[PDB]
Design a protein around this ligand. Sequence first.
Ligand SMILES: [Cl-]
Ligand SMILES: [Cl-]
Lengths: 411, 408, 14
Amino acid sequence: LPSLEDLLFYTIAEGQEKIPVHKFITALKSTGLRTSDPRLKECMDMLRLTLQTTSDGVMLDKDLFKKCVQSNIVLLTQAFRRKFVIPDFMSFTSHIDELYESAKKQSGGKVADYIPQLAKFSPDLWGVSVCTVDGQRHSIGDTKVPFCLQSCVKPLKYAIAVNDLGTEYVHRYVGKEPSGLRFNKLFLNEDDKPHNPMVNAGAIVVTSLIKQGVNNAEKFDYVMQFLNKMAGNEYVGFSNATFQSERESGKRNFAIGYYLKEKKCFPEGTDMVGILDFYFQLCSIEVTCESASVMAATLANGGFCPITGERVLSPEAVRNTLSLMHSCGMYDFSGQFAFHVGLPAKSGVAGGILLVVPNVMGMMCWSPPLDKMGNSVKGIHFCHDLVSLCNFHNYDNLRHFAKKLDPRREG
Amino acid sequence: SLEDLLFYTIAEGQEKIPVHKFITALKSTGLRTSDPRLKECMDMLRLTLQTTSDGVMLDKDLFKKCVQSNIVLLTQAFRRKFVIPDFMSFTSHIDELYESAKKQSGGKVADYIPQLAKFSPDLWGVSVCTVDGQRHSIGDTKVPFCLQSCVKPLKYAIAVNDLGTEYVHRYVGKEPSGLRFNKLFLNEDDKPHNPMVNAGAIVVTSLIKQGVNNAEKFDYVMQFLNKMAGNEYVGFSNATFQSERESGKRNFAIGYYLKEKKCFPEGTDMVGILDFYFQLCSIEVTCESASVMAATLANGGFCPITGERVLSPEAVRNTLSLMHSCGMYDFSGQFAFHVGLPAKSGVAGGILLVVPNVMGMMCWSPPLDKMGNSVKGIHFCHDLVSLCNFHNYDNLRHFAKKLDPRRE
Amino acid sequence: AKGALQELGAGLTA
Ligand SMILES: [Cl-]
Ligand SMILES: [Cl-]
């Protein structure tokens, strides 16, 4: 009748009477969990305070250890006993490292220059962050360098709209399918609605649905307070310089605005020129690979932020978002990507690709050089390789899958 | 020892098992006594029992002798290790989805050929086959009907299996047209947009078993579909074939367009390909046989009731991908979005449905809606995903009010 | 939960 915390103590202890705190921490990191994880704060607080009462500030005997670990014991136990969605995380991150290096050799593409903020980023910035639905984290390359979401925001604001207003309301204004033609084509579907919320027209109408009857200052903070929940309070910023240049060069976008109002695509009472303004702000929100990967993980984890356990989005909002990301998330490459990679992803002109592996993990990949369709060259290459290695394709089978690795099972 | 352990769970010793107790316990797991994987067991029970004084009771030595050759499967079944461990409760949920779809009576039975117009509007059948071979049927599941366009994925799967993705996709695209299934036209590359539009299925048809006469091409497909269905019913309706061919002008118009655009491989006999196309549409299944075919697709190309490798992983993966976004005609996009499962519909009323890693199904009800899809079939599919976390993008850990049949 | 883990692991480890 041994308690969970007695069990944890004996596994880490390895026959000794006291556990050096450094060894507990080292072991914890090996699971992929960070000591900074919000769900572990109490354990970390207890360790700090309790170690200052100690003669050496290193050694925790059973009862002390049992006390520090109690409040997080189930999570800690899942972690050490290899119960997380990827049980061998160190192995896995080694594979991610190799795919990153491989992608790294692809130096083609051209950095976006429609505004000068984008022009300025070095071609060789390349980072990849992973966050599992259990909050196992890993990064390689440039993962702490801020950049703009640009179109990666589309699926997120659409999720907010569905979360507050429901599917039926939002889809009075916007369709649910791929256009079938080129994204760079201004047109509406059979019922006069933009085809889906991933095309520019659709994202603009969706923008107009959020926090109606309030002002652009309030709308934008409401949206940021949302992205922060999605990211477990990790970095969400704003580029006022991108916002200005986006607005300075907004002719092509305003037309769409005009066209959309003329066809009665906005809700009764819409101030188009302000909606477009709000739309430019949201494109200019800043993330890192690290923080964006938790956002994607929230989407992989059914709307719950994996590093806080907080419900951030309704199930209907998440499911839908993933469905539209599957179909319309990579511009003109969307159908090929669906076919070959088979994961919900969303690209943006800053070089970001937000990727979800449902039930497993989120990922943000970033490299500024873009191919012909406006997708990141390193990012597209990486996403192909991940799915060649691992049985992550939507329509990969979990029992019979050839020479693919399944990271959810142990070697 | 394993066989030892199975003896006791049923025996409650009891120094002997009545064979019927063993058979009713085994049926309740979802398996059928006719299961091809269970044949040695059944042959041994028959033979051994004939040497017995009563013909019912088995002791440990004899029971262990009968069960030995198939004990891993028998133990997985009995220890609730199959993908739906509580199958009796699952099938009762299916029955309820069946009865609720049964009250929908809208739609029009197809009547461009006489063979199709003959089918009573009240025919309604639903069969399930899990990836472990668990079977359930309710309604009219043992009646012959034509696959029609439900054949489109199976013939694409065959072509990719035999020729590879790269070859097949020299001739056909990989995505939705996003315009009406009605045509015709070709994508930017002068290919039919995908293998599920009529123009695409016609070009796929022209790839399979090239250089051989139609009689051996057809036999070859028939043999393949037999391996997909675990040797269950695959027939052919000659009457439907002849009538499809007579009133086929519209498919011939597509073939002449494709011919003039150079969409067929070198040496293609256009009219000959049309004959094979109409022959494939006219291939008969029942809901039960088609359910195993769908389950082969749910189980990565292994037939669940035989264990045989029928289709390559690439072939199943791609097929399921295109059924996801092109299988339900003009309702495709809305179906992907709301139901979120690969499915393919046919003009005879069939919906071939795959829940990957879980099960296949065939739903059949002749009255169709305005888009060409079975009214009861579409309803049943929505209800299924309303009830259960089977949508592609449902979550496996956090799913609100939905039931997860994968857990106990 | 806590119960499920405690059964499984006491067995395996003890
Ligand atoms: Cl963008
Ligand atoms: Cl059809």
